Amino acid sequence: VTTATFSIGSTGLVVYDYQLLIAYKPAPGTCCYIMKIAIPSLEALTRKVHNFQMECSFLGMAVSTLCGEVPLYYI
Amino acid sequence: VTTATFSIGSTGLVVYDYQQLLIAYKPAPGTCCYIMKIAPESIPSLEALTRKVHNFQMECSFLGMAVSTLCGEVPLYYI
Amino acid sequence: TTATFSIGSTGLVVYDYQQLLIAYKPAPGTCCYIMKIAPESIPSLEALTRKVHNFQMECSLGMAVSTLCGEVPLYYI
Numbered sequence: 001v002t003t004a005t006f007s008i009g010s011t012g013l014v015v016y017d018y019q020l021l022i023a024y025k026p027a028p029g030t031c032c033y034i035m036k037i038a039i040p041s042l043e044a045l046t047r048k049v050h051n052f053q054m055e056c057s058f059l060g061m062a063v064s065t066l067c068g069e070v071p072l073y074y075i
Numbered sequence: 076v077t078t079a080t081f082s083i084g085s086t087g088l089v090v091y092d093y094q095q096l097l098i099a100y101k102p103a104p105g106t107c108c109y110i111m112k113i114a115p116e117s118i119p120s121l122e123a124l125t126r127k128v129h130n131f132q133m134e135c136s137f138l139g140m141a142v143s144t145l146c147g148e149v150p151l152y153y154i
Numbered sequence: 155t156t157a158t159f160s161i162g163s164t165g166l167v168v169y170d171y172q173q174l175l176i177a178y179k180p181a182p183g184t185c186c187y188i189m190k191i192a193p194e195s196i197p198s199l200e201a202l203t204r205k206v207h208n209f210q211m212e213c214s215l216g217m218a219v220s221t222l223c224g225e226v227p228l229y230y231i
Contacts, residue, residue: 001076004141005158018140028203041147043104061171062157068198079218080158081166093217120224
């Protein structure tokens with residue numbers, strides 16, 4: 001199963017690794033929030049990001065590309 | 076399952092599901108999803124799909140994991 | 155397997171880990187930059203964004219790469 005990447009807002013990016021985890025990166029050069037999944041919609045993830053104020057403030061090929069050179073916060 | 080996601084315009088998002096041979100397009104958050112079937116021999120480039128979206132006036136006026144993530148909570152229109 | 159990301163306002167990238175190549179398109183109807191990558195040193199999205207900006211790559215194959223780059227010239231760099 002090829003992972004799904006999505007854009008959130010103007011600079012935000014998400015990687016759904018159906019590894020069973022989600023990686024959210026608010027903007028270039030900030031950070032990555034790593035969440036384990038048991039699967040929320042893209043719209044539900046966008047609200048959660050804002051509600052939990054996720055603004056910074058061995059995982060798979062796709063998550064390593066997105067989150068390489070930035071700190072990882074496992075939540 | 077072999078799929079790919081892309082951006083279109085200011086807010087548009089697209090999912091190409093090469094296995095199921097379908098395309099899901101969402102013009103913006105909270106709007107709708109257009110589901111299209113594709114012929115196995117004529118998968119359209121991103122440019123071709125951008126023109127098709129304009130030509131069909133896709134302005135919102137079973138499926139895989141990636142399509143369900145994109146289109147959860149909005150109405151689906153088959154074209 | 156493959157992964158797609160956005161760079162700036164209109165830029166799009168396809169990472170093709172199976173064919174060990176990167177396809178960057180700076181805007182619709184421009185061109186695609188095709189780059190070869192070493193399996194032991196795949197560049198991060200951060201590093202590719204810098205490569206794209208520093209070399210001013212403004213245009214002056216698998217399923218996902220063909221979809222992104224169909225209809226525009228390819229520059230192998």
